[PDB]
């Protein structure tokens, strides 16, 4: 009943000068879900007598 689509983020450009360490950055992610849980319906009962006395 579920359905999965992954998501992903982006990194950011950073500057550096001579002897400066390159700071590592994470790239976050996640997931998304779509869950079917409801049943749409139409329920129309016709009695026998009304059937026998109407087209």
């Amino acid at each position: 009943n579920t359905y999965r689509i992954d998501r992903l983020n982006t990194s950011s450009v950073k500057g550096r000068t001579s002897g400066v360490a390159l700071e590592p950055t994470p790239v976050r992610n996640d997931k998304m879900l779509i869950v079917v849980d409801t049943v749409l319906y139409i329920r129309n009962p016709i009695d026998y007598q009304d059937d026998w006395t109407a087209p």
Binding site: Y48, Q49, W52, T53
Partner: protein, 53 residues
Amino acid sequence: FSKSRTLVTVEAKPFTSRIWDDEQNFANVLDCYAMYQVGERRPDTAAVVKFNE
């Protein structure tokens, strides 16, 4: 009365005996139904006799 013009039997569902298997309840239930209506066309042709004890 007259046996041709004194009565009428309007029928929408004639006599019907039907057997259907109930599954939720263990049962070979038998139905037997009939829907109709009787009316007295031309009541002037009928002659009842009341009996007053």
